[PDB]
Write a structure and sequence with these properties.
Chains A, B: It comes from Canavalia ensiformis. Two copies of one chain form a homodimer. With 237 residues, chain A is mainly beta. Chain A is 0% helix and 31% strand. The radius of gyration of chain A is 17 Å and the shape is globular. The complex binds calcium ion (2 copies) and zinc ion (2 copies). One zinc ion (ZN) is lined by residues 8, 10, 19, 24, 26 of chain A.
């Protein structure tokens, strides 16, 4: 299986597999059984403002999720990405639905890494700022049943029957270019993101959650990940 | 023939095909016969600092090269990047030699595009800063006989014959990810570069020049390019 680390914005409560009793933010290390969880308000179709940092000088993997006039979902778990995730990786978005409906529309996504030639020897980058996901964006390897375009949006669902998001569908948004990590040139790459989303209510008690993974450079939708496995993990342990 | 726009840092006069009697910085629009040239000093084994911009607030395609304690060769030619070059490109580096030897070591490279999602509203980017070319740099699509690693260097010659780099060698260094240009969301894509090279004196009239192109998304070595075709042109037209 592909070694994969995500920050799950899960919306279906799974006290079966370690998701808490409430719709939560979660931080996954090679398992859907997460490390930290936090209560999240989860307003309806509104805007998005999520954020991820991992500064190896502080070695925390923090995150927030902010609506307007809401609060931050601090889910900072202490994990070292030295040994738990491969040398060259492939960041991207993951979304899913199953037996319910919920909207998985991304409106903008960004990134910035800064990785240590010899710390003050002019660290590298892979910054990008996709605010305007177009129709034929050919630097994305969107897998699954994910689509793009039709507005400035990233529609990570089979959609548009009045947007009614067509349950049991999986969508991924793998970015095209790799990122050097392992430690090896040490791992101070404070890789930032911004994860603006719009989880609109279909009036259905909406629940299956969006993610933000960091996979291996080779991946797929492994053997069925529609549902509580949430788009990227093969196994529920 | 792939559509390609390059900045020849030509270290050899090619009077048969329009290169001037002096070694020169150049500029190319689907042509090894350059639009505009300027005198370049072409020092021995030293370092580097080149820089290429195209801001459509002024629509000038500029290029400057400066050693430390040397001058700058502004070779700016107004050309309309609207129609002369496709929507999606694959930028990179190109260097070659033939019947005379020269070292074409690149030791750092950057790029920074900024194209108008909606002019104020948070334009896109592709900033990277490769100061630490590794032995197994898997985000380069280095073609031909390009080598890398063994130091912090990008050796675009078959090298290590005591730095006498095995004449009629050629090697390209295409970056891994595409860039949106054509117009469509108009063409303020102020792509930057920083192109610190090293051209070692072989005691052999160092010659055949390094390039920096903006090609088609599909490319290779065109029909043999060890020489006047400078690594990226099929024909002398
Ligand atoms: Ca769930
Ligand atoms: Ca030439
Ligand atoms: Zn969860
Ligand atoms: Zn020339």
């Amino acid at each position: 299986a592909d070694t994969i680390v995500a920050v799950e914005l899960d919306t279906y409560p799974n006290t079966d597999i370690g998701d808490p009793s409430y719709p939560h933010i979660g931080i996954d290390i090679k398992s859907v059984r997460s490390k930290k969880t936090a209560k999240w308000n989860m307003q309806n179709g509104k805007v998005g403002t999520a954020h991820i940092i991992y500064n190896s000088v502080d070695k925390r993997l923090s995150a927030v999720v902010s609506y307007p006039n809401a609060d931050s979902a601090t889910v900072s778990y202490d994990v070292d990405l030295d040994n738990v995730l491969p040398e060259w990786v492939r960041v991207g978005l993951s979304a899913s639905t199953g037996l319910y409906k919920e909207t998985n529309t991304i409106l903008s996504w960004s990134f910035t890494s800064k990785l240590k030639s010899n710390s003050t020897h002019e660290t590298n980058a892979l910054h990008f700022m996709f605010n305007q996901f177009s129709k034929d964006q050919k630097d994305l390897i969107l897998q699954g049943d994910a689509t793009t375009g039709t507005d400035g949006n990233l529609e990570l669902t089979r959609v548009s029957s009045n947007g009614s998001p067509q349950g049991s569908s999986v969508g991924r948004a793998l970015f095209y270019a790799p990122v050097h990590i392992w430690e090896s040139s040490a791992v101070v790459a404070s890789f930032e993101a911004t994860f603006t989303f719009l989880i609109k209510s279909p009036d259905s008690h909406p629940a299956d959650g969006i993610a933000f993974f960091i996979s291996n450079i080779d991946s797929s939708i492994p053997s069925g990940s529609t549902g509580r496995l949430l788009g990227l993990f093969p196994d529920a342990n």
